[PDB]
Amino acid sequence: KEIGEEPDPEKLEAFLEEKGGNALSHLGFLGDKRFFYSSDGNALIQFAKVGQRLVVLGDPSGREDSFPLVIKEFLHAADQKGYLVIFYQIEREDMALYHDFGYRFFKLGEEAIVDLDTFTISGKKRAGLRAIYNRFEREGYTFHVEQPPFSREFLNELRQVSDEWLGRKKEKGFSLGFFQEDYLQKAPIAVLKSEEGEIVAFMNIMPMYREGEISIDLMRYSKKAPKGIMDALFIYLFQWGKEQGYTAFNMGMAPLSNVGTSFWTERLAAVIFNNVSYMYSFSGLRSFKEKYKPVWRGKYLAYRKNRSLPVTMILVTRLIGRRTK
Ligand SMILES: NC(=O)[C@@H](N)CCCC[NH3+]
């Protein structure tokens, strides 16, 4: 029998609320990743199979005290089938869990974490964001957060916006969300309507698996959405989040800066610049998120062989592109 369990929404939902989760836990409702529950029943590893190589999405979910156990069991179970195990988008404070198994780390980027309490558009340099907000407020756009269950009529209106936003592009997966009705029923959906009540944009609000932190997964808008649409949505989102009592917002991962000062090869360099599309949501520009003055939280790739790092990145990139062969 193949390693891991079939993705089960009911079991996952029960687990994430009774044991807790992380930033990438909600992505398990896409049904495109296999699950590996620990024998303790307190920890969970989500992953995807690519040939003889398994790619884990993030750190384990659940009780952190069972994290060494689930990693031990998962790696052992993969040792039997002779599979290579890769960990994608883990955090620094959990490096000790993987270092003992001889894993190396590579910084993929940083997540923009915006303080909702100290965020404002009243700043002297915040004249740009305040102008965008005022214009949307002037033209009569309204922001609303809807709760599941959602009707077909509502989903149809979201699909029209989504399809128009996608264009000729197809959906990505694994570490990114896509338009699935089952998945969309699992969380609140925030919409932006015009004066005529026409939905021109939508976002799905991702569950609190931390302190007072929230985030979104999908952010899509139609062609009739005004310029600065993405900036406007985050402003409305931050306003709503602060109103609900949330402390922080995760704007998703952004590419690293040029550091400022080598293990760099031409192989690795070409792969990374090719990759700048599949790992950074909303905008591939770090400056887009940086202007919100966020606290950067690094995400790392856990690998074993350094010479196989360029290939590893390609396999993960294609996995996000929904191809495993
Ligand atoms: N999951 C997301 O961030 C979606 N808003 C876009 C994914 C497909 C991009 N071509």
**Is the previous residue joined to 68 through a cis bond, with omega within 30 degrees of 0?**
no
Biggest distance spanned by C-alpha atoms of the chain? 63
| Cα 230 to the center of its chain, rounded Å | 17
User: Would the CB of 281 count as within 6 Å of ligand 1?
Assistant: yes
Tell me how far the alpha carbon of residue 169 lies from the centroid of ligand 1, in angstroms: 10
Query: How many CA atoms lie within 13 Å of 81's alpha carbon, on the beta-carbon side?
Result: 16
Torsion 182-188-192-195 (CA) sign: positive
Atom number in ligand 1 closest to CA 172: 8
Compute the Cα dihedral for 77, 80, 85, 91 and give only its sign.
Answer: positive
Sign of CA dihedral 96, 98, 102, 107: negative
Buried b (16+ CB within 10 A) or exposed e, 173-202: bbbbbbbeeebbebbbbbbbbbeeeebbbb
What's the one-letter identity of residue 301? L
Which residue, by CA, sits nearest to atom 1 of ligand 1? 177
Q: Give the helix ranges, DSSP H, for 205-308.
A: 229-244, 266-275, 286-290
CA dist 216 → 147, 165, 213 (Å): 14, 17, 11
Which positions ≥6 away from 225 have C-beta within 8 Å?
Answer: 192, 200, 201
Atom of ligand 1 nearest to the CA of 220: 5
Reported structure resolution in angstroms = 2.1
CA nearest ligand 1 atom 4, residue: 218
Go through 290-309 and write b for each residue having 16 or more CB atoms within 10 A of its CB, e for each that does not: eebebebbbbbbbbeeeeeb
The number of the ligand 1 atom at minimal distance from the alpha carbon of 281 is 3
Residue 87 CB partners (closer than 8 Å, separation 6+)? 55, 56, 58, 59, 98, 103, 301, 302, 303
- DSSP 3-state assignment of 64? helix
Classify burial at 13, counting beta carbons within 10 Å of its beta carbon; exposed 0-12, middle 13-18, buried 19 or more: middle
* Burial group, residue 158, by CB count within 10 angstroms (0-12, 13-18, 19+): buried
Q: How far apart are CA 281 and CA 87, in angstroms?
A: 19
Is 219 a pocket residue for ligand 1 (Cβ < 6 Å)?
yes
- The answer to whether residues 38 and 69 touch, using CB atoms and an 8 Å cutoff, is yes
Q: Indicate the helix (H) or strand (E) that contains 182.
A: helix 181-184
CA torsion angle 223 227 228 233 (round to 10): -40
Q: How far is the CA of 175 from the centre of ligand 1 (A)?
A: 10
In this structure, the number of other CB atoms found within 10 A of the CB of residue 270 comes to: 12
Q: What separation in Å is there between the alpha carbon of 146 and the centre of ligand 1?
A: 20
Radius of gyration of the chain (CA): 20
**List of residues 6+ apart from 38 with CB closer than 8 A:** 44, 62, 66, 69, 70, 73
The alpha carbon of 178 and the centre of ligand 1 are apart by a number of angstroms equal to 6
Q: Is 138 helix (H, G, I), strand (E, B) or coil?
A: helix
